[PDB]
Amino acid sequence: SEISRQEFQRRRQALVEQMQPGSAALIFAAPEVTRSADSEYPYRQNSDFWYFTGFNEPEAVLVLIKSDDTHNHSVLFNRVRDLTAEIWFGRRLGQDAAPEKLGVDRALAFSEINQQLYQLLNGLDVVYHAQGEYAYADVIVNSALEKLRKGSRQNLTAPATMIDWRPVVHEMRLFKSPEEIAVLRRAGEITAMAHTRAMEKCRPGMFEYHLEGEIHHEFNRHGARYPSYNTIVGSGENGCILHYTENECEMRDGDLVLIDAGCEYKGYAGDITRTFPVNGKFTQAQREIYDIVLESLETSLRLYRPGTSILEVTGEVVRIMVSGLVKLGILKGDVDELIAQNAHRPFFMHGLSHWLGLDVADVGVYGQDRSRILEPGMVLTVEPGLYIAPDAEVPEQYRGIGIRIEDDIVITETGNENLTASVVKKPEEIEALMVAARKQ
Amino acid sequence: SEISRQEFQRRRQALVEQMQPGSAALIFAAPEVTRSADSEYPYRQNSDFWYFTGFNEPEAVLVLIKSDDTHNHSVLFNRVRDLTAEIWFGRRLGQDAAPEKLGVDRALAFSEINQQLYQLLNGLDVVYHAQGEYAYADVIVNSALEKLRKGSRQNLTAPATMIDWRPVVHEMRLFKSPEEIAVLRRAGEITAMAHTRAMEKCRPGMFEYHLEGEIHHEFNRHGARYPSYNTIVGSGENGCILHYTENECEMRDGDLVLIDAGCEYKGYAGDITRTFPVNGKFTQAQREIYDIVLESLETSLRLYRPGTSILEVTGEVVRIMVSGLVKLGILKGDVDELIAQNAHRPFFMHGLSHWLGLDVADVGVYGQDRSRILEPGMVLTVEPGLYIAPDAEVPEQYRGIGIRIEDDIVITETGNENLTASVVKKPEEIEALMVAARKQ
Amino acid sequence: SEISRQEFQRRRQALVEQMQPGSAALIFAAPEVTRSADSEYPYRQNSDFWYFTGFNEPEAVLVLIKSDDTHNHSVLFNRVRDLTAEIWFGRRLGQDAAPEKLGVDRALAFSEINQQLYQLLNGLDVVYHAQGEYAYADVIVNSALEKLRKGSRQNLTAPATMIDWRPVVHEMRLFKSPEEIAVLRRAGEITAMAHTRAMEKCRPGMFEYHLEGEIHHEFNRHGARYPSYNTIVGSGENGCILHYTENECEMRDGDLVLIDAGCEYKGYAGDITRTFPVNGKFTQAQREIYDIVLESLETSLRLYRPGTSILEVTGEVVRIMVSGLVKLGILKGDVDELIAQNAHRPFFMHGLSHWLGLDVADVGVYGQDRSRILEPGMVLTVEPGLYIAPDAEVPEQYRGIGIRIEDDIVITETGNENLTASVVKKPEEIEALMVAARKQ
Amino acid sequence: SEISRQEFQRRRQALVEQMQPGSAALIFAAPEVTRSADSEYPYRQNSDFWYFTGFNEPEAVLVLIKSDDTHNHSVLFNRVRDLTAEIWFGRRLGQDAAPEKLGVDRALAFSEINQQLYQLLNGLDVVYHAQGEYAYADVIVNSALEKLRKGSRQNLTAPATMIDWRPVVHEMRLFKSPEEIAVLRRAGEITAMAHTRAMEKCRPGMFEYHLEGEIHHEFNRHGARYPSYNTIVGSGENGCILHYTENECEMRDGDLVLIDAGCEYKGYAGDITRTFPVNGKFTQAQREIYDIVLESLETSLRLYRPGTSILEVTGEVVRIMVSGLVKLGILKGDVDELIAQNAHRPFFMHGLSHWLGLDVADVGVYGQDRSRILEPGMVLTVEPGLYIAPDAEVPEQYRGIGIRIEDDIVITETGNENLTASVVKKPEEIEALMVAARKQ
Numbered sequence A, B, C, D: 001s002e003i004s005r006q007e008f009q010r011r012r013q014a015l016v017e018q019m020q021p022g023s024a025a026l027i028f029a030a031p032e033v034t035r036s037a038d039s040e041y042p043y044r045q046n047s048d049f050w051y052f053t054g055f056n057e058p059e060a061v062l063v064l065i066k067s068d069d070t071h072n073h074s075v076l077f078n079r080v081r082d083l084t085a086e087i088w089f090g091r092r093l094g095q096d097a098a099p100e101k102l103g104v105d106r107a108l109a110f111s112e113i114n115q116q117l118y119q120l121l122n123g124l125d126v127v128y129h130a131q132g133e134y135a136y137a138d139v140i141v142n143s144a145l146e147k148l149r150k151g152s153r154q155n156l157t158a159p160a161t162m163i164d165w166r167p168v169v170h171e172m173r174l175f176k177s178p179e180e181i182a183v184l185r186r187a188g189e190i191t192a193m194a195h196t197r198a199m200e201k202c203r204p205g206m207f208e209y210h211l212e213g214e215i216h217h218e219f220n221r222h223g224a225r226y227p228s229y230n231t232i233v234g235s236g237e238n239g240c241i242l243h244y245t246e247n248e249c250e251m252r253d254g255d256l257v258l259i260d261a262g263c264e265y266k267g268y269a270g271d272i273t274r275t276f277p278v279n280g281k282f283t284q285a286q287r288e289i290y291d292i293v294l295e296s297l298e299t300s301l302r303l304y305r306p307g308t309s310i311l312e313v314t315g316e317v318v319r320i321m322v323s324g325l326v327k328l329g330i331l332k333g334d335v336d337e338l339i340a341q342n343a344h345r346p347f348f349m350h351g352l353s354h355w356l357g358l359d360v361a362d363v364g365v366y367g368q369d370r371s372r373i374l375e376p377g378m379v380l381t382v383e384p385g386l387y388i389a390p391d392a393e394v395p396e397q398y399r400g401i402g403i404r405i406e407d408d409i410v411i412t413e414t415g416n417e418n419l420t421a422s423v424v425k426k427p428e429e430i431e432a433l434m435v436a437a438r439k440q
């Protein structure tokens, strides 16, 4: 599954529909990024630029011009064909091929942007620009507007109104099309296969980074070349560090390992966490904490639906956690009083859910305390966890246990669809999976 | 094999030995780099900063103070211990532990750099600073010097002389210690195992990116988490693109695939290229071009030694290439006249060799036209290639063939050591390797 | 005559009336400007900031908040009272006194602007800001908006719409109140007295700069401390240079001197040009050119009125000039054909008129080719000139003559009022004035 | 008196003598400075640039190249001849005329600086540059060095050492040539005539700014067009503000007026302060304070000589002040104890002396607490003062009195020459001067 030319075009048109007559929207590509000296990191297109183009080159700018309420057109600035540059560094789309390939009306060389952009903005009332997104982009836009402001003797005029299109565009991204959901479903499947593989491969004495290697190989074979974020493989005490990415330790017989990893497939993020015993068998202490996190996730998956909110579901999870921690003697006191005191926070210190899409921590307004009412088309994670620090003042057997279990869901008309349930999470299923692998 | 605390210390001392009395050298860490929105690329420390510290954190600055010809000391600025930041994002070395861990005299919080740096520079004659390396670093240094310049009423004075330490440090990096060579030897071995794996796994119908996946998994299992540069897997016509990294095509029965990939092991780069038939058997045309590139590499490996140069060895390769291309009818005319006209350049348009080390295209002065005389301790690649474009005016059977074969070598007292000869390159050996794999 | 607190307040209210509900307008003071090393030029407040405050301090920002269609208020950021800074550098208004003195609702310390500005913008829909006017201002505004954009977890929101208030404010400035016209009338009177003085003082052998000295002294004694622009005193060939400010030459018996000088009185510019003989008597050649420039000015003064334009009146002047130059043999051919060819342009190469106000070349839209229809309340100059270069291919006697004659006018309901007719311009009146002075 | 071409040349040569072989020094002109909108302040050349050129244009850069110990040459970048730009804005020196006019070897267009500067720096070991002096200059220099650093394949190399030439050049400026002293002597004479005029013109009811007008007119008539700093005319309580420049009050019968004003003559500053009664007669209270400041100045003028210091002479002044203030009951206690407590500081809170030259607060190292030993050729001010605030806890009659008396001196082989003694300062001489003027 992918996003096609006609969908990118529909998105451009939907933005144009929201724009004032006599305006232009400017969407800039990501800069290339140095890794060291003259070597660059693998290119990652800006999510918003990608959303409207599916075009994976730097030095590109999409300009949507809404001349009035019926007439609009698009102009792409992009790198020129250049035989020597292409022999060295790769093929370029160029100007001749872009209109047909991308479904834009006109294409111009990026090298000419300063000579041309002001001409496109001249006489417009409004420019939509994400000020501060990129320095290079602000320079180009500010230069164009200055030429227009200072150009009255050449009959030039600048648009006086600049509107940040990020809020409008991020609200578009928050609600996924069926095609987007299909892509996210595939990302979830790929990511789940990777996690299953990690559980089947994990043995005491392997290094945390070995599981990262297994996961990334699995992503790759299904055509998700890159992870959507830096893979976390936190064994033992390392699991208590939320974004542990050192992945440098030897995994010990008797420790849990917490894996938070997700692929990037056609631009879209998977995002799964599974925690499991390195040796294939939960200890009693590990199981006692695990059961509370799993109940939290299972209850959340029952509850998430249109008309509730992340805040409302979080309240249910907090009750589950406080209740469970009191039963184990990790917290002491009356459950309702402890809830009132947010007594869970030393052990569950992050949010239950974030939006998911072209960014793993995806764009879109959450509302105060993530109270926004959920609607069909929203995609989000569900990621309860409990982290008991090595020096926590709790019964000894729980110290140094970090557990998180995370699925990706889409809100539907009656509830939700779990995109990542194809990798096991019930403790008996984890143990059976690992037992079977360990016998081979 | 690795580089240890005492070696990092020896390097700092060797720099101090080269510094003027009454001076300070400032070496800054790399910034963290955005991949998309709030996600960052995996951190890569600045090579020069790494060379003197082995410290893999951002927000760090090494200050070497040479008070006079006998007295010197070191100060590290680095991130403070912070329980909440560490729970979220990972452990920090902090100030208490740094002197012992890194072998520096003092450690101070990076948050205090603007309050402290000017005090360390006050009254010195010379500051060594790599101006323009990083914007954030220039801001810090320029601010410190301004405070000193403007501080005469507070009895402050700025060093009037600023010296770029890059030339001195890059000349240090150009000559590897035995420990560095051991690390590079291991990088070469790891990288060679990865290339052997790619040849053994390659089958028609696999995608170029699948071989990338095999290679990166192999790097990872030996503890080289990341490649030293973006992997190139160019099959068919894609092999004619020097830094082809799209790796997006289905590999065809009858095409060659050119793989240029290298690991990063303890900071140091491997860098191997092998080209081989996708179906395990070179065609006659493919073999005819391959033989010329291989002879070029083999002759270069015989020749490279102290007292010759990249330029001198390149002349021998050019003769081999022109001679071979005339024999096949790709070039026409007298060999010596064609050499005089650089007639090989449409087909071999890049350099034979680059330095290798903490950067894949490593630092160090080459001399005019890479004429610098070679000495023991230099490490370099040997990477002849021939690329016959799909539209070249040559006998048809050669069109769309791109072949490069690259090894990594170290110059020794009598010649060179090949660090990457453990992956085959003779065509009969490539075919035997692939035949054996294809029968499994 | 001056502009008073209540008028500054009316202007602020008139801007607020034009603003969208749920918005804030930000108007920043001018930076102080270095002359050399640690010495600064005399402070000149930003015209727009002045227009809304009458406040002559740097490090000040006026914030007009329109909460909704009935509720609005003003906040001034300005320098705090500071006993030591004031002993050294001058008194400051401070926060306690500002509301009463300036008629603003609240005053806050400029040192707190970054801690406070984002709080004032939070939750607004629109911010009015003159982007690019000052770097320091853009930094402050961009920082505030970034804090808001990134502050969703603190329940902060940024206004998505930024509107340049310059067009609205400059249209306000283009139409003068009666009080403004009174101030401009006084500026015109002061400037005219200065020009009369220069004619009465001028003698052969004096330097051009001596007349500058006379003029500036005259400005000063009437309470116009500073000129509104750099005084031009161009004698002989120097008169052919439009903005000649070197003023370095000895004025020669037989040359004309062209003086373009104007005071700045309560922020408002006078702008007069008079040209006259250094020795008090026009030569025939000088008079022949002078008569054409004077007829051009006199006809323009008859014509300027509501309903015509600078472009229309310029056409009449061009005819006068071409006709006169043909009569003298400076141009050759048919007058209407020469007009069609813009044959006057080598000799009259600038505009007839510019707006006049808080800037000498005042703000406001002219329309294409200065075609905007004139209306009561506009204030403008009328400045025909003819400049015959020393090497012009014209009858010899005219070479090196530069003449400009300029008055300041206000458009009224039936025509115009000349603000600067109290300094003579008829050649017989100039000669009588100078003869009388030369006899003393 | 002036500074001539051959002296500017001698200075360039003296700098070259101090430079390392294989180096270039870069000295940049001042930017033009906006006053308001499209009007600029009168141009003031950068003092250091002026010191080496006597060239009063912007967009100019002096490059001194010391190829080795015997061979050196100079290159000026400056604005090209341009007929239209010159007709509009003034004559330009251009490239053809510059070598002869300024005594430089070569001149190139400023528009070509980025194409040419790197070529001049290529292969040098050292560049002398005043980093941070001007943003535009840093941009040009940093760009040149980057091209060289990145240009190894074009056989380019950057100088690795950058030296701030300000310390060397400012030490040159600290010691005046006889020609410089002649110019400063004339500045002192002009400035003294201006102060005498102010005393002769001052009457109760005039505004502070009227005396500014008299002073500036006097500067102008002697060919010092501009003041060297913003004129201070502080009457009554305003005299207690050290750099009072509002000059806005009506001068009252019974108040003193303190005038601190100085001309700029051929680039060099005069700097005189005189305080005198507005009505021509000191009151007893005024005279009592005045006598202490005058004794302080007179004693300083006796003492200043080679081999003493500003710090040493300041100690003598402090004793005079404390002794006098005890006698009047303004201070109470033992003189030596009060001196030990710096009890004078509420009333004399600034330094006695600053260097004087191309800047009024001139360049040059003072040493700790201005302890540097004086030598012939140094030029400095002597400016004791006493300021008794309106709310000081002192006998009532002294409240609101601010007195400063300042002369400019040059250190000579036996003592000093007073450059400004031609304007009276003894109270009986001030009164006689004013009485005589008031009778006219």
Ligand SMILES: [Cl-]
Pocket: A078, A079, A080, A109, A110, A111, A112
């Ligand atoms: Cl391009």
Ligand SMILES: [Cl-]
Pocket: B078, B079, B080, B109, B110, B111, B112
């Ligand atoms: Cl820190």
Ligand SMILES: [Cl-]
Pocket: C078, C079, C080, C109, C110, C111, C112
């Ligand atoms: Cl403040």
Ligand SMILES: [Cl-]
Pocket: D078, D079, D080, D109, D110, D111, D112
């Ligand atoms: Cl130029």
Ligand SMILES: [Mn+2]
Pocket: A271, A354, A381, A383, A406
């Ligand atoms: Mn997540």
Ligand SMILES: [Mn+2]
Pocket: A260, A261, A271, A272, A273, A383, A406
């Ligand atoms: Mn996750």
Ligand SMILES: [Mn+2]
Pocket: B271, B354, B381, B383, B406
């Ligand atoms: Mn290589």
Ligand SMILES: [Mn+2]
Pocket: B260, B261, B271, B272, B273, B383, B406
């Ligand atoms: Mn390679």
Ligand SMILES: [Mn+2]
Pocket: C271, C354, C381, C383, C406
């Ligand atoms: Mn004018």
Ligand SMILES: [Mn+2]
Pocket: C260, C261, C271, C272, C273, C383, C406
């Ligand atoms: Mn004018």
Ligand SMILES: [Mn+2]
Pocket: D271, D354, D381, D383, D406
């Ligand atoms: Mn002074």
Ligand SMILES: [Mn+2]
Pocket: D260, D261, D271, D272, D273, D383, D406
């Ligand atoms: Mn002074």
